[PDB]
Swiss-Prot record:
The gene is cbnB2. Belongs to the bacteriocin class IIA/YGNGV family. GO terms for cellular component: extracellular region. The chain holds residues 19 to 66 of 66 of the full protein. It is found in: Secreted. It comes from the Bacteria. Disulfide bonds join C9-C14. The keyword Disulfide bond applies. This is Bacteriocin carnobacteriocin B2. It comes from Carnobacterium maltaromaticum. The lineage of its organism: Bacteria, Bacillati, Bacillota, Bacilli, Lactobacillales. The keyword Secreted applies.
Amino acid sequence: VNYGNGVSCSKTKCSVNWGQAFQERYTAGINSFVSGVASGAGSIGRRP
């Protein structure tokens, strides 16, 4: 049973999507920027 979206795996692979990478890569550098910048003065710069 369980007929929904788990029996038919997308694409002919299924192992690791780029999504995971981009987030581990980008957030990794984007996250650090916060902590570091938070130590010096991160109470006035939250405007993308």
